Amino acid sequence: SLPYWSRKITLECTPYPFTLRWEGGVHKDGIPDKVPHPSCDPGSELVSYT
Amino acid sequence: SKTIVLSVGEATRTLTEIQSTADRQIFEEKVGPLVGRLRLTASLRQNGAKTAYRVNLKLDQADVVDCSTSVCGELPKVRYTQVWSHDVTIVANSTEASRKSLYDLTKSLVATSQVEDLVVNLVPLGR
Amino acid sequence: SKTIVLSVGEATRTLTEIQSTADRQIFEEKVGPLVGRLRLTASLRQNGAKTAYRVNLKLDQADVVDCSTSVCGELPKVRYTQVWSHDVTIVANSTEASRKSLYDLTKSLVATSQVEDLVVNLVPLGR
Amino acid sequence: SKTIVLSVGEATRTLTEIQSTADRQIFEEKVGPLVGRLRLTASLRQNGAKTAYRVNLKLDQADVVDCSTSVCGELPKVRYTQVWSHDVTIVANSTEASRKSLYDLTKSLVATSQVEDLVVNLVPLGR
RNA sequence: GGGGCGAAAUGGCCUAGACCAUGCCCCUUGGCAAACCCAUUCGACCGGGUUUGGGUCUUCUGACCUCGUAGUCCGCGCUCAGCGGACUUCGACCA
Secondary structure (H helix, E strand, C coil): CCCCCCCCCCCCCCCCCCCCCCCECCCCCCCCCCCCCCCCCCCCCCCCEC | CCEEEEECCCCEEEEEEEECCCCCEEEEECCCCCCCCEEEEEEEEECCCCCEEEEEEEEEECCEECCCCCCCCCCCEECCCCEECCCECCECCCCHHHHHHHHHHHHHHHHCHHHHHHHHCCCCCCC | CCEEEEECCCCEEEEEEEECCCCCEEEEECCCCCCCCEEEEEEEEECCCCCEEEEEEEEEECCEECCCCCCCCCCCEECCCCEECCCECCECCCCHHHHHHHHHHHHHHHHCHHHHHHHHCCCCCCC | CCEEEEECCCCEEEEEEEECCCCCEEEEECCCCCCCCEEEEEEEEECCCCCEEEEEEEEEECCEECCCCCCCCCCCEECCCCEECCCECCECCCCHHHHHHHHHHHHHHHHCHHHHHHHHCCCCCCC
């Protein structure tokens, strides 16, 4: 038998992608259709966003 | 040879290995008279088809009496004999944590005051 | 022994001589698991009445699979086996220039893109 | 591999080991055309019931001819073949001095001028 | 009972030969090594009965401990454990 030495070290992680979403818009005075494109048409604008 | 030191509280007793054998280990206490003293028998073996094991531990101690202090003529004679054997049946593929917990529970049950009362006052264990 | 270095593009593989014999030379690749790896068999002989010669070159490589990473018990098991033998029948009294031209033509046919497509897409050679 | 250098007087010939095997060692001379050159076959074995041994040494050399220097078309063709085998039957439990004396006598008989005349002029040995 | 033999001991037959009579050759299988049980001087005392005896995971194929049996290259070096180590096979209550 003979002498010997060594060492080791490692670091790693697993990848995993995912997605998040959210939409909205301006609240209007009595507009029952608030969509990305408000179906109604009162008198002002609704910017919305998705 | 192989020496074992036991602390009783104020003095230390020494047991010496006398019959070194694999299937039977005989330890004897060396204090004065070798006949009628403290002896310990240890044995280790297997069982069945290489499954578990078997450990046996016995401790004997016979009291002696003598009349040479007053009476003209009386050799040291043994009186009674006490036998305290054991039996350990622990399988190889077990659990170290479970074995440690069992040993701790056994040590606690031995060191408790209930077994001491059961031994001394001969009162059944139930406190 | 005898070491052979093969360049795949980004790494270098090393094959070591294992079974040194005249009529059968066995080279084996040393990377990790020796069973189910890259092996090469070489043979050289004569023919008839000391006219020509015969050279045989075979290359085998069997893939292995293992489940010890997830399943709690499966030894490395071989899957399929690939055999790629050769046959060289070149007479002694030939021509060095002709042999060099034949070797160059074989190298060009091996390095061409038609044999690669025939191997991969299993499409018959004909471009 | 194993190289053997032979001095003819003005040039040195080199024989290379080609078929490395215990029961048959084949040495070939490397000069030019491998076919029809100098070959040497060596063999070593035992005999009977572990008593003595048996050594065989054969030396062959076939001359070649070629007409490509003048004639349009003629591959190198072998002409005659010469066979010079040997047979050594020396027991193990012998004598080193006797073996050395026998080897010296054989060397003297080989280097003498009588065997040379017997080989060249085909005159029976008797001077 | 099941077989063998004319050898081998002799007698018929007995250049030779192949069969006969008593007549002689074997099987009546064998072994487990441990643990526990009785009535009592309310154990000494010999004898009997029960649970185990290469072993588990899916003892289904097939593998995971162990070895036994072989064949093959083998190292004269590479690996943290190291090492002398590799691959393929059949068996595993005992004569």
